Amino acid sequence: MKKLQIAVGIIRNENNEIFITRRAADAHMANKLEFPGGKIEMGETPEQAVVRELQEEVGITPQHFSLFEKLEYEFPDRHITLWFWLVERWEGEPWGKEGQPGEWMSLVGLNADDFPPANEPVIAKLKRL
């Protein structure tokens, strides 16, 4: 029964590829991916937090960005909150997670198919991404 809030940031440039995250060398059946993230307790707002996590993570420069749509979840007795701010383009290796590598996937518009069930509120929008 505690409040948990993370802070992730996805990147997308080159042509239409994102720096997402997938099963490095594990997973059981089918492929599964998710969104980066780390923590949102060092910022005071939904921007000060990531905005500063911009250079305080990987250190890109022309990583223009904006807010797409943050979702909200709730467990049988817990509180799962997360944010979804997609960027547009940068010059350098982007950041996001820490124990997760991540990779530049080039498809067209990620959908809920490759996105494991649990992020329907935002993935639904990324469907036409």
Side-chain angles (χ1 to χ4, degrees), residues 27-97:
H28 191 61
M29 53 117 76
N31 304 148
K32 67 90 112 86
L33 43 101
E34 215 229 290
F35 296 101
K39 199 140 133 233
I40 188 184
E41 313 224 65
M42 215 98 65
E44 225 218 316
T45 359
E47 244 165 5
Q48 281 260 122
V50 103
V51 80
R52 127 182 299 165
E53 295 257 74
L54 212 299
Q55 330 219 135
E56 303 271 359
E57 285 281 61
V58 103
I60 9 187
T61 274
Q63 183 188 8
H64 217 211
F65 38 57
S66 231
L67 180 71
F68 133 57
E69 229 246 19
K70 156 257 287 211
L71 41 46
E72 254 181 330
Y73 218 45
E74 203 220 23
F75 243 36
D77 63 285
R78 306 241 285 167
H79 317 116
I80 290 294
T81 292
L82 224 110
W83 325 67
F84 264 53
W85 81 306
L86 256 299
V87 311
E88 255 132 51
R89 59 235 248 321
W90 58 107
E91 188 162 285
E93 248 210 353
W95 43 263
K97 252 305 243 277

Coordinates of all heavy atoms in Angstrom, one line a residue, residues 27-97:
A27 N 14.0 -14.3 -21.5 CA 12.6 -14.5 -22.0 C 12.4 -16.0 -22.1 O 13.3 -16.8 -22.3 CB 12.5 -13.8 -23.3
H28 N 11.1 -16.4 -22.0 CA 10.8 -17.8 -22.2 C 10.2 -18.1 -23.6 O 10.8 -18.7 -24.4 CB 9.8 -18.2 -21.1 CG 9.6 -19.7 -21.1 ND1 10.7 -20.6 -20.8 CD2 8.6 -20.6 -21.3 CE1 10.3 -21.8 -20.8 NE2 9.0 -21.9 -21.1
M29 N 9.0 -17.6 -23.8 CA 8.4 -17.8 -25.1 C 8.0 -16.5 -25.8 O 7.8 -15.5 -25.1 CB 7.1 -18.7 -25.0 CG 6.2 -18.0 -23.9 SD 4.6 -17.5 -24.7 CE 3.9 -19.2 -24.8
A30 N 8.0 -16.4 -27.1 CA 7.7 -15.1 -27.7 C 8.6 -14.0 -27.3 O 9.4 -14.2 -26.4 CB 6.2 -14.7 -27.4
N31 N 8.5 -12.9 -27.8 CA 9.4 -11.8 -27.4 C 8.6 -10.8 -26.6 O 7.5 -10.5 -26.8 CB 10.0 -11.1 -28.7 CG 10.7 -12.1 -29.6 OD1 10.7 -12.0 -30.8 ND2 11.3 -13.1 -29.0
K32 N 9.3 -10.2 -25.6 CA 8.6 -9.2 -24.8 C 9.4 -7.9 -24.5 O 10.6 -8.0 -24.4 CB 8.2 -9.8 -23.4 CG 9.5 -10.1 -22.6 CD 9.8 -8.9 -21.8 CE 9.7 -9.2 -20.3 NZ 10.9 -9.8 -19.8
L33 N 8.8 -6.8 -24.5 CA 9.6 -5.5 -24.3 C 8.9 -4.6 -23.4 O 7.8 -4.9 -22.9 CB 9.9 -4.8 -25.6 CG 8.6 -4.8 -26.5 CD1 7.9 -3.4 -26.3 CD2 8.9 -5.1 -27.9
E34 N 9.4 -3.5 -23.1 CA 8.8 -2.5 -22.2 C 9.3 -1.1 -22.4 O 9.9 -0.8 -23.4 CB 9.0 -2.9 -20.7 CG 7.8 -2.6 -19.9 CD 8.2 -1.9 -18.6 OE1 8.8 -2.5 -17.8 OE2 7.9 -0.7 -18.5
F35 N 9.2 -0.3 -21.4 CA 9.8 1.1 -21.5 C 10.9 1.3 -20.4 O 10.9 0.6 -19.4 CB 8.6 2.1 -21.2 CG 7.6 2.0 -22.3 CD1 6.4 1.3 -22.0 CD2 7.8 2.6 -23.5 CE1 5.4 1.1 -23.0 CE2 6.8 2.5 -24.5 CZ 5.6 1.7 -24.3
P36 N 11.8 2.1 -20.8 CA 12.9 2.4 -19.9 C 12.4 2.9 -18.5 O 11.3 2.6 -18.1 CB 13.7 3.5 -20.6 CG 13.1 3.8 -21.9 CD 11.8 2.9 -22.0
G37 N 13.2 3.7 -17.8 CA 12.7 4.2 -16.5 C 13.8 4.1 -15.5 O 14.8 3.5 -15.7
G38 N 13.6 4.7 -14.3 CA 14.7 4.6 -13.3 C 14.1 5.0 -11.9 O 14.0 4.3 -11.0
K39 N 13.6 6.2 -11.9 CA 13.0 6.7 -10.6 C 12.6 8.2 -10.8 O 13.1 8.9 -11.6 CB 13.9 6.6 -9.4 CG 13.2 6.7 -8.1 CD 13.8 5.6 -7.1 CE 14.0 6.3 -5.8 NZ 15.4 6.1 -5.3
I40 N 11.6 8.6 -10.1 CA 11.1 10.1 -10.2 C 11.0 10.7 -8.8 O 10.0 11.3 -8.4 CB 9.7 10.1 -10.8 CG1 9.3 11.5 -11.2 CG2 8.7 9.5 -9.9 CD1 7.9 11.6 -11.7
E41 N 12.1 10.6 -8.0 CA 12.0 11.2 -6.6 C 13.1 12.2 -6.5 O 13.3 12.8 -5.4 CB 12.2 10.1 -5.6 CG 11.3 8.9 -5.9 CD 10.7 8.4 -4.6 OE1 9.9 9.1 -4.1 OE2 11.0 7.3 -4.2
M42 N 13.8 12.6 -7.6 CA 14.9 13.6 -7.5 C 14.4 14.9 -8.2 O 15.1 15.9 -8.2 CB 16.1 13.1 -8.2 CG 17.3 13.6 -7.5 SD 17.9 12.3 -6.3 CE 18.4 11.0 -7.6
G43 N 13.2 14.9 -8.8 CA 12.7 16.1 -9.5 C 11.5 16.6 -8.7 O 11.0 16.0 -7.8
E44 N 11.0 17.8 -9.1 CA 9.9 18.4 -8.4 C 8.7 18.4 -9.4 O 7.5 18.6 -9.0 CB 10.2 19.8 -8.0 CG 9.7 20.1 -6.6 CD 9.2 21.5 -6.5 OE1 9.8 22.4 -7.0 OE2 8.1 21.6 -5.8
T45 N 8.9 18.2 -10.6 CA 7.7 18.2 -11.6 C 8.0 17.1 -12.7 O 9.0 16.4 -12.6 CB 7.6 19.5 -12.2 OG1 8.6 20.4 -11.7 CG2 6.2 20.1 -11.9
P46 N 7.0 17.0 -13.6 CA 7.1 16.0 -14.6 C 8.1 16.4 -15.7 O 8.3 15.7 -16.7 CB 5.6 16.0 -15.3 CG 4.9 17.2 -14.6 CD 5.8 17.8 -13.6
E47 N 8.8 17.5 -15.5 CA 9.8 17.9 -16.5 C 11.1 18.1 -15.8 O 12.1 17.5 -16.1 CB 9.4 19.3 -17.1 CG 9.1 19.1 -18.6 CD 8.4 20.3 -19.1 OE1 8.2 21.3 -18.3 OE2 8.0 20.3 -20.2
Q48 N 11.1 18.8 -14.7 CA 12.3 19.0 -13.9 C 12.9 17.6 -13.6 O 14.1 17.4 -13.6 CB 11.9 19.6 -12.6 CG 11.7 21.1 -12.8 CD 12.9 21.9 -12.3 OE1 13.5 22.6 -13.1 NE2 13.3 21.7 -11.1
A49 N 12.1 16.7 -13.5 CA 12.5 15.3 -13.2 C 13.3 14.7 -14.4 O 14.4 14.3 -14.3 CB 11.3 14.4 -12.8
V50 N 12.6 14.5 -15.5 CA 13.2 13.9 -16.7 C 14.2 15.0 -17.4 O 15.3 14.7 -17.7 CB 12.1 13.5 -17.7 CG1 12.0 14.5 -18.9 CG2 12.4 12.1 -18.2
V51 N 13.7 16.1 -17.5 CA 14.5 17.2 -18.1 C 16.0 17.1 -17.6 O 16.9 17.2 -18.3 CB 13.9 18.6 -17.7 CG1 14.3 19.0 -16.3 CG2 14.4 19.7 -18.7
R52 N 16.1 17.0 -16.3 CA 17.4 16.9 -15.6 C 17.9 15.5 -15.9 O 19.1 15.3 -16.0 CB 17.2 17.2 -14.2 CG 17.8 16.1 -13.3 CD 17.5 16.4 -11.8 NE 18.1 17.7 -11.4 CZ 17.8 18.3 -10.3 NH1 16.7 19.1 -10.3 NH2 18.5 18.2 -9.3
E53 N 17.1 14.5 -15.9 CA 17.5 13.1 -16.2 C 18.1 13.0 -17.6 O 18.7 12.1 -18.0 CB 16.4 12.1 -16.0 CG 15.9 12.2 -14.6 CD 16.4 10.9 -13.9 OE1 17.6 10.8 -13.6 OE2 15.6 10.0 -13.6
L54 N 17.8 14.1 -18.4 CA 18.3 14.1 -19.8 C 19.9 14.0 -19.7 O 20.4 13.0 -20.2 CB 17.9 15.4 -20.4 CG 17.7 15.2 -21.9 CD1 19.0 14.7 -22.6 CD2 16.6 14.2 -22.1
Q55 N 20.5 15.0 -19.2 CA 22.0 14.9 -19.1 C 22.4 14.1 -17.9 O 23.5 13.5 -17.9 CB 22.6 16.3 -19.0 CG 21.6 17.3 -19.7 CD 22.4 18.4 -20.4 OE1 22.2 18.8 -21.5 NE2 23.5 19.0 -19.8
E56 N 21.6 14.0 -16.9 CA 22.0 13.2 -15.7 C 21.7 11.7 -16.0 O 21.4 10.9 -15.1 CB 21.2 13.6 -14.5 CG 21.4 15.1 -14.3 CD 22.6 15.3 -13.4 OE1 23.2 14.3 -13.0 OE2 23.0 16.5 -13.1
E57 N 21.9 11.2 -17.2 CA 21.6 9.8 -17.5 C 22.6 9.3 -18.7 O 23.5 8.5 -18.4 CB 20.2 9.6 -18.0 CG 19.2 9.7 -16.7 CD 19.3 8.3 -16.0 OE1 20.4 8.0 -15.5 OE2 18.3 7.7 -15.9
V58 N 22.3 9.8 -19.8 CA 23.2 9.5 -21.0 C 24.0 10.7 -21.4 O 25.2 10.7 -21.6 CB 22.3 8.9 -22.1 CG1 22.2 9.9 -23.2 CG2 23.0 7.7 -22.7
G59 N 23.3 11.8 -21.6 CA 24.0 13.1 -22.0 C 23.9 13.3 -23.4 O 24.8 13.6 -24.2
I60 N 22.6 13.4 -23.9 CA 22.4 13.7 -25.4 C 22.3 15.2 -25.5 O 22.1 15.9 -24.5 CB 21.2 13.0 -25.9 CG1 20.4 12.3 -24.8 CG2 21.7 11.9 -26.9 CD1 19.3 11.5 -25.4
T61 N 22.3 15.8 -26.6 CA 22.2 17.3 -26.7 C 21.0 17.7 -27.5 O 20.0 18.3 -27.0 CB 23.5 17.9 -27.3 OG1 24.4 18.1 -26.2 CG2 23.2 19.2 -28.0
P62 N 20.9 17.4 -28.8 CA 19.8 17.7 -29.7 C 18.6 16.8 -29.5 O 17.9 16.5 -30.4 CB 20.3 17.6 -31.1 CG 21.6 16.7 -31.0 CD 22.0 16.7 -29.5
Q63 N 18.4 16.3 -28.3 CA 17.3 15.3 -28.0 C 16.0 16.1 -27.8 O 15.5 16.1 -26.7 CB 17.7 14.5 -26.7 CG 16.6 13.5 -26.5 CD 16.7 12.8 -25.2 OE1 17.6 13.2 -24.4 NE2 16.0 11.8 -24.9
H64 N 15.6 16.7 -28.8 CA 14.3 17.5 -28.7 C 13.3 16.5 -28.1 O 13.3 15.4 -28.3 CB 13.8 18.0 -30.1 CG 13.2 19.3 -29.9 ND1 12.2 19.7 -30.8 CD2 13.4 20.4 -29.1 CE1 11.8 21.0 -30.4 NE2 12.6 21.4 -29.4
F65 N 12.4 17.0 -27.2 CA 11.4 16.1 -26.6 C 10.1 16.8 -26.3 O 10.0 18.0 -26.3 CB 12.0 15.5 -25.4 CG 12.8 16.5 -24.7 CD1 12.2 17.7 -24.3 CD2 14.2 16.3 -24.4 CE1 13.0 18.7 -23.6 CE2 14.9 17.2 -23.7 CZ 14.3 18.4 -23.3
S66 N 9.1 16.1 -25.9 CA 7.8 16.7 -25.5 C 7.0 15.6 -24.7 O 7.5 14.5 -24.5 CB 7.0 17.1 -26.7 OG 6.6 18.4 -26.6
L67 N 5.8 15.9 -24.3 CA 5.1 14.9 -23.5 C 4.0 14.3 -24.4 O 3.2 15.0 -24.9 CB 4.5 15.5 -22.3 CG 3.7 14.4 -21.5 CD1 4.7 13.4 -20.8 CD2 2.8 15.0 -20.4
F68 N 4.0 13.0 -24.5 CA 3.0 12.3 -25.3 C 1.7 12.1 -24.4 O 0.7 12.7 -24.6 CB 3.5 10.9 -25.8 CG 2.6 9.8 -25.6 CD1 1.3 9.8 -26.1 CD2 3.0 8.7 -24.8 CE1 0.4 8.7 -25.9 CE2 2.1 7.6 -24.6 CZ 0.9 7.6 -25.2
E69 N 1.8 11.2 -23.5 CA 0.6 10.9 -22.6 C 1.0 10.0 -21.5 O 1.4 8.8 -21.7 CB -0.5 10.3 -23.4 CG -1.8 11.1 -23.1 CD -2.8 10.1 -22.4 OE1 -2.3 9.1 -21.9 OE2 -4.0 10.4 -22.4
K70 N 1.0 10.4 -20.3 CA 1.4 9.5 -19.1 C 0.1 8.7 -18.7 O -1.0 9.2 -18.6 CB 1.9 10.4 -18.0 CG 1.7 9.7 -16.6 CD 0.5 10.2 -15.9 CE 0.8 11.6 -15.3 NZ 0.1 11.8 -14.1
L71 N 0.3 7.5 -18.4 CA -0.9 6.6 -18.0 C -0.9 6.5 -16.4 O -0.2 7.2 -15.7 CB -0.7 5.2 -18.5 CG 0.7 4.7 -18.4 CD1 1.3 5.0 -17.0 CD2 0.8 3.2 -18.7
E72 N -1.8 5.7 -15.9 CA -1.9 5.5 -14.5 C -2.5 4.1 -14.2 O -3.4 3.6 -14.9 CB -2.9 6.6 -13.9 CG -2.1 7.6 -13.1 CD -3.1 8.7 -12.6 OE1 -4.1 8.9 -13.1 OE2 -2.8 9.2 -11.5
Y73 N -1.9 3.4 -13.2 CA -2.4 2.0 -12.9 C -2.7 1.9 -11.4 O -2.5 2.8 -10.6 CB -1.4 1.0 -13.4 CG -2.0 -0.2 -14.0 CD1 -3.1 0.0 -14.9 CD2 -1.6 -1.5 -13.6 CE1 -3.7 -1.1 -15.4 CE2 -2.3 -2.6 -14.2 CZ -3.3 -2.4 -15.1 OH -3.9 -3.5 -15.6
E74 N -3.3 0.7 -11.1 CA -3.6 0.5 -9.6 C -3.7 -1.0 -9.4 O -4.4 -1.7 -10.1 CB -4.9 1.1 -9.3 CG -5.0 1.4 -7.8 CD -6.4 1.1 -7.3 OE1 -7.1 0.3 -7.9 OE2 -6.8 1.6 -6.2
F75 N -2.9 -1.5 -8.4 CA -3.0 -3.0 -8.2 C -4.1 -3.3 -7.1 O -4.7 -2.4 -6.7 CB -1.6 -3.4 -7.6 CG -0.9 -4.4 -8.5 CD1 -1.1 -4.3 -9.9 CD2 -0.2 -5.4 -8.0 CE1 -0.5 -5.2 -10.8 CE2 0.4 -6.4 -8.9 CZ 0.3 -6.2 -10.2
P76 N -4.2 -4.5 -6.8 CA -5.3 -5.0 -5.9 C -5.1 -4.2 -4.5 O -6.0 -4.2 -3.7 CB -5.1 -6.5 -5.7 CG -4.0 -6.9 -6.7 CD -3.4 -5.6 -7.4
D77 N -4.0 -3.7 -4.3 CA -3.8 -2.9 -3.0 C -2.5 -2.1 -3.1 O -2.0 -1.6 -2.1 CB -3.6 -3.9 -1.9 CG -2.4 -4.8 -2.1 OD1 -2.4 -5.7 -3.0 OD2 -1.4 -4.6 -1.5
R78 N -2.0 -1.8 -4.3 CA -0.8 -1.0 -4.4 C -1.1 0.2 -5.4 O -2.2 0.3 -5.9 CB 0.3 -1.9 -5.0 CG 0.5 -3.1 -4.2 CD 1.9 -3.2 -3.6 NE 2.8 -3.6 -4.7 CZ 4.1 -3.5 -4.5 NH1 4.6 -2.5 -3.7 NH2 5.0 -4.3 -5.1
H79 N -0.1 1.0 -5.6 CA -0.3 2.1 -6.6 C 0.8 2.2 -7.6 O 1.9 2.5 -7.3 CB -0.4 3.5 -5.8 CG -1.2 3.3 -4.5 ND1 -0.6 3.4 -3.2 CD2 -2.5 3.0 -4.3 CE1 -1.6 3.1 -2.4 NE2 -2.8 2.9 -2.9
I80 N 0.5 1.9 -8.8 CA 1.6 1.9 -9.9 C 1.4 3.2 -10.8 O 0.5 3.2 -11.5 CB 1.5 0.7 -10.7 CG1 1.9 -0.6 -9.9 CG2 2.4 0.8 -11.9 CD1 3.4 -0.4 -9.5
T81 N 2.3 4.1 -10.6 CA 2.2 5.3 -11.5 C 3.4 5.4 -12.4 O 4.5 5.1 -12.0 CB 2.1 6.6 -10.6 OG1 0.9 6.6 -9.9 CG2 2.2 7.8 -11.4
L82 N 3.2 5.9 -13.6 CA 4.4 6.0 -14.5 C 4.1 7.1 -15.5 O 3.0 7.6 -15.6 CB 4.5 4.7 -15.3 CG 6.0 4.3 -15.3 CD1 6.2 3.0 -14.5 CD2 6.4 3.9 -16.8
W83 N 5.2 7.5 -16.2 CA 5.0 8.6 -17.2 C 5.5 8.2 -18.6 O 6.3 7.3 -18.7 CB 5.8 9.8 -16.8 CG 5.9 9.9 -15.3 CD1 6.5 9.0 -14.5 CD2 5.3 11.0 -14.4 NE1 6.3 9.4 -13.2 CE2 5.6 10.6 -13.1 CE3 4.6 12.1 -14.7 CZ2 5.1 11.4 -12.0 CZ3 4.1 12.9 -13.6 CH2 4.4 12.6 -12.3
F84 N 5.0 8.8 -19.6 CA 5.4 8.4 -21.0 C 5.7 9.6 -21.8 O 4.8 10.2 -22.5 CB 4.2 7.7 -21.7 CG 4.3 6.2 -21.5 CD1 4.5 5.6 -20.3 CD2 4.2 5.4 -22.7 CE1 4.5 4.2 -20.1 CE2 4.3 4.0 -22.5 CZ 4.5 3.4 -21.3
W85 N 6.9 10.1 -21.8 CA 7.2 11.3 -22.6 C 8.1 10.9 -23.8 O 9.3 10.7 -23.6 CB 7.9 12.4 -21.7 CG 9.3 12.2 -21.5 CD1 9.9 11.0 -21.0 CD2 10.4 13.1 -21.7 NE1 11.2 11.2 -20.9 CE2 11.6 12.4 -21.4 CE3 10.5 14.4 -22.2 CZ2 12.9 13.1 -21.5 CZ3 11.7 15.1 -22.3 CH2 12.9 14.4 -21.9
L86 N 7.6 10.9 -24.9 CA 8.4 10.5 -26.1 C 9.2 11.7 -26.7 O 8.7 12.8 -26.7 CB 7.4 10.0 -27.2 CG 7.4 8.5 -27.3 CD1 8.8 8.0 -27.7 CD2 7.0 7.9 -26.0
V87 N 10.4 11.4 -27.1 CA 11.2 12.5 -27.7 C 11.1 12.5 -29.2 O 10.4 11.7 -29.8 CB 12.6 12.4 -27.3 CG1 12.7 12.2 -25.8 CG2 13.3 11.2 -28.0
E88 N 11.8 13.3 -29.9 CA 11.7 13.3 -31.4 C 13.1 13.0 -32.1 O 13.2 12.2 -33.0 CB 11.2 14.6 -31.9 CG 9.8 14.5 -32.3 CD 9.0 15.6 -31.7 OE1 9.4 16.8 -31.8 OE2 7.9 15.3 -31.1
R89 N 14.2 13.6 -31.6 CA 15.5 13.3 -32.2 C 16.6 13.8 -31.4 O 16.5 14.8 -30.6 CB 15.6 14.0 -33.6 CG 15.4 15.5 -33.4 CD 14.2 16.0 -34.3 NE 14.8 16.9 -35.4 CZ 15.7 17.8 -35.1 NH1 15.7 18.5 -34.1 NH2 16.7 17.9 -36.0
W90 N 17.8 13.2 -31.4 CA 19.0 13.6 -30.6 C 20.3 13.2 -31.3 O 20.3 12.6 -32.4 CB 19.0 12.9 -29.3 CG 19.0 11.4 -29.5 CD1 20.1 10.6 -29.3 CD2 18.0 10.5 -30.1 NE1 19.8 9.3 -29.7 CE2 18.5 9.2 -30.2 CE3 16.6 10.8 -30.4 CZ2 17.7 8.2 -30.6 CZ3 15.8 9.7 -30.9 CH2 16.4 8.4 -31.0
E91 N 21.4 13.6 -30.7 CA 22.7 13.2 -31.3 C 23.5 12.5 -30.2 O 24.3 13.2 -29.5 CB 23.4 14.5 -31.7 CG 24.6 14.2 -32.5 CD 25.1 15.4 -33.3 OE1 24.5 15.7 -34.3 OE2 26.1 16.0 -32.9
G92 N 23.4 11.3 -30.1 CA 24.2 10.5 -29.0 C 23.4 9.3 -28.6 O 22.3 9.1 -28.9
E93 N 24.0 8.5 -27.7 CA 23.2 7.3 -27.2 C 22.3 7.8 -26.1 O 22.8 8.3 -25.1 CB 24.3 6.3 -26.6 CG 24.3 5.1 -27.5 CD 24.6 3.8 -26.7 OE1 24.9 4.0 -25.5 OE2 24.5 2.7 -27.2
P94 N 21.0 7.6 -26.3 CA 20.0 8.0 -25.3 C 20.0 7.1 -24.0 O 20.7 6.1 -24.0 CB 18.7 7.8 -26.0 CG 19.0 7.1 -27.3 CD 20.5 6.9 -27.5
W95 N 19.4 7.6 -23.0 CA 19.3 6.8 -21.7 C 17.9 6.3 -21.5 O 17.1 6.4 -22.4 CB 19.7 7.7 -20.5 CG 19.0 9.0 -20.6 CD1 19.6 10.1 -21.1 CD2 17.7 9.4 -20.2 NE1 18.7 11.2 -21.0 CE2 17.5 10.8 -20.5 CE3 16.6 8.7 -19.6 CZ2 16.3 11.4 -20.2 CZ3 15.4 9.3 -19.3 CH2 15.3 10.7 -19.6
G96 N 17.6 5.8 -20.3 CA 16.2 5.3 -20.0 C 16.3 4.4 -18.8 O 15.9 4.8 -17.7
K97 N 16.7 3.2 -19.0 CA 16.8 2.2 -17.9 C 18.2 2.1 -17.4 O 19.1 2.8 -17.9 CB 16.3 0.9 -18.3 CG 14.9 0.6 -17.7 CD 15.0 0.7 -16.1 CE 14.7 -0.6 -15.5 NZ 13.2 -0.8 -15.4

